[model samples]
Target: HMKKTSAQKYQESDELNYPLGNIDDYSVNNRIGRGKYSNVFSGHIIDSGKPIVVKVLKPVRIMKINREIAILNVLRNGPNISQLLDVVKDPDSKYISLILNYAENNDVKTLFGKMTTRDIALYIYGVLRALAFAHKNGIMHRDVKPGNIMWNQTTKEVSLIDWGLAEFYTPDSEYQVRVATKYYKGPELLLSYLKYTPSLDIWCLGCTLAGLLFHKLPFFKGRDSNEQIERMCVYLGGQAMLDYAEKYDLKLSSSLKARLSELKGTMWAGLINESNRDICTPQALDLLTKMLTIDHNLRPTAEQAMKHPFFDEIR
Candidate 1:
């Protein structure tokens, strides 16, 4: 069977029919963010003085652009999901620019370090709401890392930005494993188990929460995919990793195999230190441990995670 484009795969009733937004109507200023495929600029609508984010694609496939646009459209009404305001294309160079709502706050890297336990709870709560909505609609975020999540601490506003790596979930289809950041890649992704569901996104959220609760930016720090699995096994236990591999018939690399053989797992409570001990409460550990499970099938859905007792106060 021939591969289908994202637009075709999702088959939304609304066609890929966005108006040709006028480039002159918007003005871009300082470059706000950069990634492998695009660079974003802080911009505003020239007519309205309204804040906006202009994300310009850097020489990528039309398919990729269409995928993001399609997914953004699908999740437009989702709470905390970034809204696509306009789409602009250059006639001469065929360059594309996506106009989106801007989040007025520092990047998550700086903000995450200073958050109170309550703040982390609220932030993750917003993300879970967004992911639960997306998963209900059959879309996997695929790249649910801190960089893609934005929030204003003062305003209590959150936005899950960037649908470039997001995809429409299909039960029988095997997806590409090269998605998501190294630190946030799930066990399923690391082991190249392609028949994953939206639970992988929950694992990414688990990694983000683990870092916050423990005061380490990336809770599981791995140099490469090989080391990633090894680090995972070390914390999650090699026996469980072996069990998962056997169940899925996953083949581990020689390095990962040797590393897993010699290591045992540590309990989550042992990871807490004096610095972050105050925020590492019982309910927090319960929610985090459930989300960080090695088995993707057992990982809680975003909806289920939102209902965990850790978020009770925030609810």
Candidate 2:
């Protein structure tokens, strides 16, 4: 059995109030957003008058609730990461609550869906800085999509949140396969590789950049996992992906290989053209390329990525 720390037990205790220990403590303000698993509410700290976001997890999904809390504990303190103020549990119910920093500005998802090229460049700079810090501390935030990145409008600072699936790199251990959102999974992950590095987060960064520039995910529109994989192969090229598979000892079907080779650069051409003509700035694309490399070994470290021209202006 997995050992539970005192902090973990304290968080799991039944003595506290469920779904936010004391609703009276925080005056109900406004509904901000809702995900499939949680509902986000905007509120303020009763004592300090500071704004905060409360994420209430669904009671039916016990495992997910626990995972979110565990991940947050691991990311307690880091400059670029959002702080988890507290976890509240009600003695009477199964629901749990997570209090976090409220981003008065916007999240990366909201910003990407609406921002221009110039705004995207600025947002990406802060995000890369956060990634650099997280990677240095040995935390791999498997989910780096726009939804997990929040921006404080007042401070103009970017904070990475929602560490439900984050993990540390461990060699020689049985590879645990956890698929993040389809848009962000690295090629190796798509191919079901047994081992991976923090570069996986970098890959997500690339997809996020593409989404910002195109206003949509480049490899999206697939109805299912197979289609998603095929779409990715087509854009990345067959020989390149095959070379990656061989280097990494991945086992992909022959049919998948054939499809990947013949798909050509239909998707890639569109992205490259847009990046050159409309975007103009090569910093995002350059950093993206390094992150999306099929050979994870060739992928640039977060520290190196922070030094790229993309962040020069922001830094």
Candidate 3:
């Protein structure tokens, strides 16, 4: 059993009218996105012409669903964080509906190729801004791949959405390594380092930035956890992480050891083909190289990266 979530805990702060079906002003229709847990549809409220997304969740674990709502509540006070507009559902049915702001252009990936160099800088900078705010609050967004980042290409409005894997870091809390999407998993996750931090999200963002700039839909296409490192090794080769693990009294799994032994690193220059010319600036490359390093400690903090020379002219 777990403690009551904020949805139940903060019953009267005026946001969640609680018990879910407590509000129903918004009418929903047309599915635009689908997944195992929920299906999001384009929707709108009475007298409000602006479009919205109605995410209808299939009945599963109540705790997971409630936790997401609670995180959204806490994040609402921060900048660039997606707002949970409303909640509606049947009191005695198998589904619950969540109302959220809709982005006209969907995710950043769809438009990355078409976006100007300045757009790429602003896009990643926006990600870092939201991440910095979350980290300061002790909340780590474990899933921040390009897909979870919502943006309006025309308006340049951004919203960091999806709180399913977002967690509050109570000091020394043990977390699962299998969190974010495979290609975006950080070195800590690949190594099964249970003690993760907010910087983990930076690795994911780094992967997103690399993908957008390199013109390779996926910058690192590793088939599995072993190949994940292999993919990085193909570009950056292997580092002296064994000592880092041993120093911390941590042991790598047998599979990781075997994978490491077979690795021979690749050069960064190899990635700069003619296809990636537009977004590949010196400052951008410098910041990106620092962010995608094998050592998480070497990676720039969200706040610090936002101040790097890479974003100077773009901002």
Candidate 4:
């Protein structure tokens, strides 16, 4: 048999029929947000009169745009994933847009300090529910950050949104390093070890967990790649860092090497304060320690993370 094409590999759901309607069919209202490559608007479909999110891209390649659509289609059945309503293009303006299911509430950035332990468990479990579902379908959410994760605070609903940075999971694939946000970048990514797997997203999830548990926005404060590695070393043993670098033939700069040499690992369990302790139980701390390791291989998968003992209370 001949090898399958990219389209065949990223099999689309039979239910979704794109090329839905004209861009004018939806009345684009308030601008919810804008990124480097896209601007998002809260809008409604004319005939249906239902709320939706309109993402207008800044004239990207068709292949890239198609890839996003393909990934979303493949993940159509994923739990807690944002739904795709339609794909529209303006005939006159020649602009393309994707209409998606809008989250009822704000993103996770605003809900940082407001979460209780149960809320944290439920919120993270929901995110992992999305991640696990996507991974099972053979996809990697290359960017898993606070803004990309949509959370409904009142209802405790979570939608892992934004397929633009996501991609199909191919073993031994060397994807671009600019895929994830700087703070959420894993150690493997920092060292340019690009044989990416779904676990890379797991590392990003861990960073978010650190933020929620420790109340430190953007948990790892790294000015550069070296500093990022240094911060990892502080939490996950410098010797392990040396071993990881050596294992993958990654040569640390002399400055980074010297820093790693003098640094000792900070105990993840010992860093808890009275304020954070409510969310930082033994099982919770154990999970965090496993997640914030120097090795991505050691980090918990989204599936496994959802089943962790820290969530047993709510489970």
Candidate 5:
């Protein structure tokens, strides 16, 4: 029922000459990552023993698979974005897998506690740079979370991975609200505002940045979609939430209406405790505030965020 994806159209114009790879040539070992759409494994070339990531896509629409490949090809040379090495498939079962260059990096939680303010600045700058490139190329990374980012502390390198939910951006075009993870979902998504732009990715990145800065791993820990918006309202203030809703002409549910009517607040400054005080500077708070704004239009673009005062030292 959906329209033809950008990849599909592009395929018609100029075919993608992706070389088919033999699965047997690669030794797929330990499972490295899992997602709704695919399972990634740490793999190596049998002949060369070169490390790689094998992303075995789940049973999904052919269009989705094509889209991921097309997007990866488009972003292959961009900074901080992972390169798709090859396309592999099981001969008999026909399970499609994407081969990518391996990155030596620890999980987000493991690396987060060890990062200093400068480290975080460099980290987010990498993410924004990747985002800026994708946006410039008319692509939007709908899922921009800490888990999807790979950082190598030793090399001081960062790569934004997982382009499964990515799509080509078209102005005023309606998109699905169910894209980003719960804690990283933008305010517009909670409101079911389908006409969202690439700014949604900015919001997700903002949430991740906030979590890292405040020592809170899922900053807005809401139980469900409804509670998700409530958590946002709780932190961002009810009045601003109300104003955003009214501006978009979005009708609020009864519970949310009651919650917003009575509540009024902004406790961002209070979040900086002794634990995160060193990293959560005033400039950091300012950047977070600007990025996490409920009004999507007010959120700074990825390129603009790189120019913020918070990134000065790291720049």
Candidate 6:
């Protein structure tokens, strides 16, 4: 693989225009989804006669979109991720658009609604394989969830998308902003701690797998950060909660500690069952456990994860 220097990787070509076309050229067929910063549209590429997905940033949020585009430029051509075909800018409006190879099947979230246990296992297996690849390359996909995973119905190919919060770990820069969707963030992030690595994505992978198995969000109905912590403590247990809190030096309220004691293992029961019971296959469980370690250090590296039994069945 050829590695480009950061400058060379992110520098825009002078001839390229950002957000170069109107909704008609791309033929915005329908709105697929919208994030806090970008709206995804189903479309076709005029030049290649290929179907594509155009993620357009709201004109007001160009800076956020530009930053994400720069990051994608630095980490392109991985089979596990969404391939960036072009980054065009509109000379008149300065709007930025990212043309990505569209996954015709929709996101993993949609897949869960229609898949069986066996199908779900296969889908998650692919996700783990992709994550492992990213981690080995020194990239942390801070956001890991069903919504971020897209599947091609015809080919059964899975692609991980949305690198807005991704960070590249190197000796010079060891930390980045703790930004990601609240529901999928790891324990360390909930405590407002920094200096973490790709392990964060592993935690999200675990939660996402559990959600797929249960057919519901793993930690649902938490309106705020405080409530989210309370819900987590209820599921993870007091001792486990305290251990993480102490390890990270996070202060907790007495009520929160007490609430943790009353909670049963219900929180992780779904994941544990999906792994241990006959519901889920051993290969699937093995990958899940490796990714969902309580201790970040114990988490599997992307390279190690790719070799697991679950992904063995995949090409």
Regions of candidate 4 where Cα sits further than 4 Å from its true position: 1-17, 107-113, 269-271
Q: Model 6, residue 267: displacement in angstroms? A: 6.1
The sequence of per-residue lDDT tens digits that candidate 6 reaches over residues 1-315 is 148653443343223324444434465578887877578888887655788888776455445555566666655756668877776655444456778877756655554446655566566667767676666677777888877887665566777888877777664344654666777777667666666777778788777876765556653447876677666655555577677778867777877777766666454454444333553566666666566565666777766666676666454
Q: Cα deviation of 76 in candidate 4 (Å)?
A: 0.8
Assess every candidate by TM-score: 0.90, 0.80, 0.87, 0.90, 0.91, 0.78
List the global CA lDDT of all models: 0.83, 0.68, 0.77, 0.80, 0.85, 0.66
In the range 1-315, model 5's lDDT, one tens digit per residue, is 259864444234222246777788888899977777688899998899999999986434667888889999999999999899898766555567899988777666665558888889888999999999999999999999988898887777999998989999999889998898878999899889989999999999989988898878788888887788777877788888889989988878987788786766665857877777888888988898899999998899998999999988878
Judged by TM-score relative to the true structure, which candidate is superior, 1 or 3?
A: 1
Model 2 misplacement above 4 A: 1-24, 35-37, 58-74, 105-118, 152-155, 264-268, 272-278
lDDT of 6 at 173: 45
In terms of lDDT, the poorest run of 10 residues in model 1 is 7-16
Off by over 4 Å in 3: 1-23, 92-94, 106-113, 253-264
Tens-place lDDT per residue, model 1, 1-315, is 248764343342122347768888899999988877788999999989999999986434767777888888899889999999999875554557899998866555665447777988998999999999999989988888777888788877888888888999989789999988888988888889988888999999899888888877777877888888888877778888888888999998766677787878875747767777788889988898899898999988888899899998989
Model 2 lDDT, full chain set: 0.68
Model 5, 258: alpha-carbon shift in Å? 2.7
Pairs with backbone N, CA or C atoms under 3 Å apart (clashes), candidate 2: 16-89, 17-89, 17-90, 18-90
Ranking by TM-score: 5, 1, 4, 3, 2, 6
Full candidate order by lDDT, most accurate first: 5, 1, 4, 3, 2, 6
lDDT of 4 by residue, 1-315 (tens): 259754443342222246567677788999988887788999998988999999986444667888889989998877899888788765544456888998876655566557878888887788888999999888989888887888777888888898898889878878887789988998888998878678888888888888888877688888988888888778777889898889878778987887898777776756578777787767767777777766767777877888888888877
Q: After superposition, how far is residue 33 of candidate 6 from its true place, in Å?
A: 3.0
